[PDB]
Design a protein around this ligand. Sequence first.
Ligand code: CHD
Ligand code: CHD
Ligand code: CHD
Ligand code: CHD
Length: 131
Amino acid sequence: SAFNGKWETESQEGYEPFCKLIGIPDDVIAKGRDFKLVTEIVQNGDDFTWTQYYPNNHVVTNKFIVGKESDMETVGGKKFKGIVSMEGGKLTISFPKYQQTTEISGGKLVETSTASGAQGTAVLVRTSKKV
Ligand SMILES: C[C@H](CCC(=O)O)[C@H]1CC[C@H]2[C@@H]3[C@H](O)C[C@@H]4C[C@H](O)CC[C@]4(C)[C@H]3C[C@H](O)[C@]12C
Ligand SMILES: C[C@H](CCC(=O)O)[C@H]1CC[C@H]2[C@@H]3[C@H](O)C[C@@H]4C[C@H](O)CC[C@]4(C)[C@H]3C[C@H](O)[C@]12C
Ligand SMILES: C[C@H](CCC(=O)O)[C@H]1CC[C@H]2[C@@H]3[C@H](O)C[C@@H]4C[C@H](O)CC[C@]4(C)[C@H]3C[C@H](O)[C@]12C
Ligand SMILES: C[C@H](CCC(=O)O)[C@H]1CC[C@H]2[C@@H]3[C@H](O)C[C@@H]4C[C@H](O)CC[C@]4(C)[C@H]3C[C@H](O)[C@]12C
């Protein structure tokens, strides 16, 4: 039940280098920095429903079972299959060019992603507070 509830972005460390690495144009990075994503999580043990509230009523819902291959969807609508493991309370997914670790730390939702681009890699640390 640890991840349960509604969360709101308070900080995004590495935000601009991360966005720059993955092709986002600089003008929209500068506009995008003040956007604070709201996340709603229903966790029933190993069963998760992860909802992100993007601009313009663009609700992105991902459902998964921990340690079991699950159908997932990106912000752009790309469907893919993935496995979210839990390692000491930390949710984790790994691809050859992408990794994410999500945890509850100091009562906050902390999301750490790493991506490969042509320049090298970039790391984003997003921290959300409970609403
Ligand atoms: C900047 C933009 C806000 C709308 C705008 O300014 O036009 C926001 C809305 C959706 C955001 C993207 C989506 O959240 C998907 C990605 C999530 C990653 O954690 C950061 C990069 C990432 C690719 C985001 C970059 C940027 O913050 C976007 C593109
Ligand atoms: C990689 C992508 C951001 C870039 C994009 O939109 O293409 C983001 C948007 C939604 C994210 C997923 C959703 O938050 C649902 C899952 C949440 C877990 O905490 C990690 C895996 C998890 C399956 C995430 C993997 C990945 O970081 C996703 C798919
Ligand atoms: C590509 C997709 C169209 C649906 C599809 O073809 O599957 C479009 C329509 C809705 C768009 C999203 C929404 O308009 C909300 C966001 C608006 C921002 O200007 C860019 C990111 C943003 C998160 C968009 C990403 C992407 O361009 C979406 C997902
Ligand atoms: C590898 C995986 C596809 C898995 C599958 O084929 O089932 C893909 C699906 C959507 C991809 C993500 C999206 O294309 C958006 C991002 C694009 C950047 O150029 C790399 C990171 C980035 C965040 C991608 C990481 C990774 O390559 C993802 C998560």
